[PDB]
Amino acid sequence: SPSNTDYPGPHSFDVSFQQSSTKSATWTYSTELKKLYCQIAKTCPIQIKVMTPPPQGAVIRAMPVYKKAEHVTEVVKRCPNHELSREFNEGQIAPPSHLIRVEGNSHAQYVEDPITGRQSVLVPYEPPQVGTEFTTVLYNFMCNSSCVGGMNRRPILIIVTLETRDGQVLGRRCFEARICACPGRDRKADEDS
Amino acid sequence: DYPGPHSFDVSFQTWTYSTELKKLYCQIAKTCPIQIKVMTPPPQGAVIRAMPVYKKAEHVTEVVKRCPNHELSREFNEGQIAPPSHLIRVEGNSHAQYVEDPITGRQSVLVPYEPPQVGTEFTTVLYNFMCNSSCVGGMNRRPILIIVTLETRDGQVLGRRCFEARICACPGRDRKADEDSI
Amino acid sequence: DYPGPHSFDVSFQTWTYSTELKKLYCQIAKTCPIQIKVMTPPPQGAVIRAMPVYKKAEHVTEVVKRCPNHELSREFNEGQIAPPSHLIRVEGNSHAQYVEDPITGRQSVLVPYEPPQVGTEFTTVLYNFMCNSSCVGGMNRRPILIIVTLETRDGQVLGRRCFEARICACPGRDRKADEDSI
Amino acid sequence: SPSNTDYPGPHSFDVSFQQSSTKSATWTYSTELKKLYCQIAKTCPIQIKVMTPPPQGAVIRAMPVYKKAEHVTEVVKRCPNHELSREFNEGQIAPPSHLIRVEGNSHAQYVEDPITGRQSVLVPYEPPQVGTEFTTVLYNFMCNSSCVGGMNRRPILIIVTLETRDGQVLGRRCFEARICACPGRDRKADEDS
DNA sequence: AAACATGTTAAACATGTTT
DNA sequence: AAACATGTTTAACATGTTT
Ligand SMILES: [Zn+2]
Ligand SMILES: [Zn+2]
Ligand SMILES: [Zn+2]
Ligand SMILES: [Zn+2]
Numbered sequence: 001s002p003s004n005t006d007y008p009g010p011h012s013f014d015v016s017f018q019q020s021s022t023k024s025a026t027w028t029y030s031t032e033l034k035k036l037y038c039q040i041a042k043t044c045p046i047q048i049k050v051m052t053p054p055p056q057g058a059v060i061r062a063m064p065v066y067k068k069a070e071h072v073t074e075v076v077k078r079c080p081n082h083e084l085s086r087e088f089n090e091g092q093i094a095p096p097s098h099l100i101r102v103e104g105n106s107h108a109q110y111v112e113d114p115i116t117g118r119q120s121v122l123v124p125y126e127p128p129q130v131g132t133e134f135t136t137v138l139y140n141f142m143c144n145s146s147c148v149g150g151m152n153r154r155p156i157l158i159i160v161t162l163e164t165r166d167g168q169v170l171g172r173r174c175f176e177a178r179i180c181a182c183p184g185r186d187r188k189a190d191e192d193s
Numbered sequence: 194d195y196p197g198p199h200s201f202d203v204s205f206q207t208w209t210y211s212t213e214l215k216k217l218y219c220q221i222a223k224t225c226p227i228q229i230k231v232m233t234p235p236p237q238g239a240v241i242r243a244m245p246v247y248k249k250a251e252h253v254t255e256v257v258k259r260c261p262n263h264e265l266s267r268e269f270n271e272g273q274i275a276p277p278s279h280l281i282r283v284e285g286n287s288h289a290q291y292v293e294d295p296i297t298g299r300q301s302v303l304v305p306y307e308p309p310q311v312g313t314e315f316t317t318v319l320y321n322f323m324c325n326s327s328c329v330g331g332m333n334r335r336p337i338l339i340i341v342t343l344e345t346r347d348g349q350v351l352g353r354r355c356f357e358a359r360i361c362a363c364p365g366r367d368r369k370a371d372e373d374s375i
Numbered sequence: 376d377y378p379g380p381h382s383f384d385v386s387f388q389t390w391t392y393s394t395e396l397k398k399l400y401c402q403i404a405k406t407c408p409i410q411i412k413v414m415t416p417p418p419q420g421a422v423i424r425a426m427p428v429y430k431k432a433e434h435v436t437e438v439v440k441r442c443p444n445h446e447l448s449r450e451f452n453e454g455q456i457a458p459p460s461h462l463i464r465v466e467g468n469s470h471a472q473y474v475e476d477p478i479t480g481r482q483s484v485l486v487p488y489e490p491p492q493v494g495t496e497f498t499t500v501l502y503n504f505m506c507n508s509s510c511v512g513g514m515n516r517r518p519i520l521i522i523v524t525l526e527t528r529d530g531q532v533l534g535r536r537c538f539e540a541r542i543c544a545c546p547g548r549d550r551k552a553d554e555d556s557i
Numbered sequence: 558s559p560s561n562t563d564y565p566g567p568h569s570f571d572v573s574f575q576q577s578s579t580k581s582a583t584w585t586y587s588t589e590l591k592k593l594y595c596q597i598a599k600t601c602p603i604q605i606k607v608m609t610p611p612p613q614g615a616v617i618r619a620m621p622v623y624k625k626a627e628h629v630t631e632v633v634k635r636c637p638n639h640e641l642s643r644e645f646n647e648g649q650i651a652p653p654s655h656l657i658r659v660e661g662n663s664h665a666q667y668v669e670d671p672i673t674g675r676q677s678v679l680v681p682y683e684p685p686q687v688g689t690e691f692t693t694v695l696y697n698f699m700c701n702s703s704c705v706g707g708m709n710r711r712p713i714l715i716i717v718t719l720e721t722r723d724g725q726v727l728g729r730r731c732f733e734a735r736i737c738a739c740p741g742r743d744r745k746a747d748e749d750s
Numbered sequence: 751a752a753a754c755a756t757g758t759t760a761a762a763c764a765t766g767t768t769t
Numbered sequence: 770a771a772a773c774a775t776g777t778t779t780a781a782c783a784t785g786t787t788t
Binding site for chain 3: 079080081082083084147148149
């Protein structure tokens with residue numbers, strides 16, 4: 001069952017979240033809590049930062065997995081309802097079963113591991129734009145973290161991993177993901193807890 | 194409106210559409226599913242171009258771009274295929290290509306046509322509008338309307354349909370109130 | 376409502392019924408006893424068909440099936456006579472037959488009519504509703520109403536009655552609150 | 558982050574606002590609230606009064622700065638929209654980025670601090686006209702106090718400072734500035750609050 | 751049935767524009 | 770000035786779940 005410990009690796013790999021506006025309540029992040037609260041199917045900008053240029057076909061794989069020990073062995077797919085619902089799939093090219101999607105990147109390739117059957121999504125690594133210090137990747141989470149027949153409100157967490165073009169892990173960072181309806185409210189309540 | 198040889202047509206099933214007002218009310222940067230329907234297979238490369246333009250005769254000659262604020266605000270731009278100036282964007286299609294006319298300077302976005310899915314009866318396109326219908330320094334609340342055109346791989350027009358677009362914050366409210374004027 | 380020649384009628388004695396709201400509030404997959412009463416013996420094969428349909432004019436044309444989750448979730452399906460797609464089920468009757476209309480695609484369930492028990496005054500049918508009135512990908516909280524129809528063995532209608540169905544989790548609460556709106 | 562406390566200084570430095578007509582609703586002042594309510598790009602007359610002639614190159618610098626602690630460190634510039642909009646900049650000589658402008662004075666010089674990057678505008682001090690008790694300076698505020706991509710309705714306040722020709726502060730006065738569309742209405746509502 | 755978790759639906763408000 | 774148009778801010782409401 002895939003590792004979830006932070007491992008900076010030779011390229012000082014790192015992921016962070018910086019707010020796209022100046023509200024914009026579509027999502028929010030508890031650096032303190034290592035939790036990302038965000039709305040379903042909406043877009044989440046995630047900042048990647050290295051300290052030294054990674055290898056060649058270097059890729060960034062984002063994989064979802066249940067937080068709690070009891071479920072870790074269960075794959076994380078979209079609930080039956082959404083995996084068919086006309087919406088979010090109609091003009092889509094991405095596997096309707098996959099939870100995690102990346103928008104704005106034709107090269108993005110979705111993958112199901114033949115043995116573990118674990119779904120994940122990869123994007124070829126490209127350095128930041130000139131004058132920019134972050135490579136930004138656009139993720140989309142396709143099921144509330146409470147879809148019955150899916151996560152059924154079981155905490156999950158994302159494992160973004162920087163890997164060599166032939167799957168060797170060069171770096172890994174994790175954060176708990178909780179896709180809902182009122183990221184604002186929920187984060188707030190979660191913090192008063 | 195020009196149905197053309199393939200009896201080209203657009204229709205709609207965070208946004209809403211007044212059939213009889215030929216007006217689309219939708220929130221900014223939110224996704225707009227749009228239905229395309231032909232009667233006979235179009236040529237081969239056949240593309241679907243979506244172009245914005247001002248409704249009022251006063252302003253038709255002025256190109257339609259995103260207001261300066263949005264145009265250069267990391268937000269929505271940062272990790273993006275499309276140019277930050279373009280108002281119309283299409284999501285869910287790597288083949289989608291954005292184009293600026295060298296002479297007219299007009300911005301538009303094309304997407305290669307493809308028959309519907311088996312059993313289906315519509316070629317559905319995903320459009321995103323990236324500036325409110327009121328951005329100062331942009332549309333400055335000047336009504337605009339979208340011109341979706343089915344064209345031949347080399348730019349020959351095969352059909353054209355058009356509806357008024359009004360991307361705001363309360364498409365519901367606005368639509369309703371806009372329905373009160375009668 | 377069409378009483379018909381046999382003065383056909385439906386009535387009610389985990390669920391509850393607002394007589395004056397013609398609304399049935401009941402929990403999912405729980406059992407609903409429904410009372411049938413005629414005035415004169417119906418024909419011979421005479422059947423009682425229960426069909427679901429959306430109350431709102433907007434959606435009447437759309438068939439009513441179980442949401443995808445329930446439709447294919449071993450739970451409630453595994454060992455079952457009836458099709459997993461069908462919303463309405465009848466328990467306690469081997470003769471009960473489920474039917475999908477080839478043309479309209481509409482789902483429904485029939486049960487052969489039988490006079491009441493001796494001394495009794497009602498033909499009681501046992502209905503099960505298999506999806507909440509709010510299942511995403513199904514009724515998506517769109518009010519539906521049941522159409523129980525007494526028909527002739529060959530499908531001729533002899534009578535029809537109808538009540539609004541709202542299968543939820545707290546029929547008590549919902550009913551009460553739904554009674555507060557007045 | 559620039560000081561905002563009133564400091565009369567050796568020359569009994571003072572700023573006040575006296576109404577140019579006898580309506581004229583282009584602006585208004587709540588002496589009581591220390592708030593100036595005024596329309597964008599329109600002209601605001603501000604009265605300067607000393608008690609003893611200031612030094613030589615003595616200047617009057619007006620600098621904008623956010624009121625609330627959370628933003629004080631952020632410079633105050635014109636929102637992107639106005640910094641390009643053909644209007645208000647076409648026949649203008651002043652930096653389209655600058656919020657505060659002074660009209661009716663060729664010697665007025667706009668300045669961006671190389672280190673802090675803070676924009677301000679200076680005007681050489683000149684005593685009142687004969688028989689007059691005030692040196693009047695004409696300011697123009699170039700962005701609503703709600704321009705998105707700019708102040709985004711964040712309260713700001715002006716810091717007019719009397720300084721020696723080589724930047725030594727001889728006096729300073731502050732007032733909250735809220736440039737809007739209906740100074741009348743807004744002030745009224747603000748007072749019923 | 752109580753206290754709670756969480757998606758759905760919108761109202762009250764702030765503030766520029768039109769009349 | 771009074772009304773109108775519109776983005777924003779915040780809340781209430783509906784309903785399955787948990788206790
Ligand atoms: Zn789901
Ligand atoms: Zn804009
Ligand atoms: Zn269901
Ligand atoms: Zn501005």
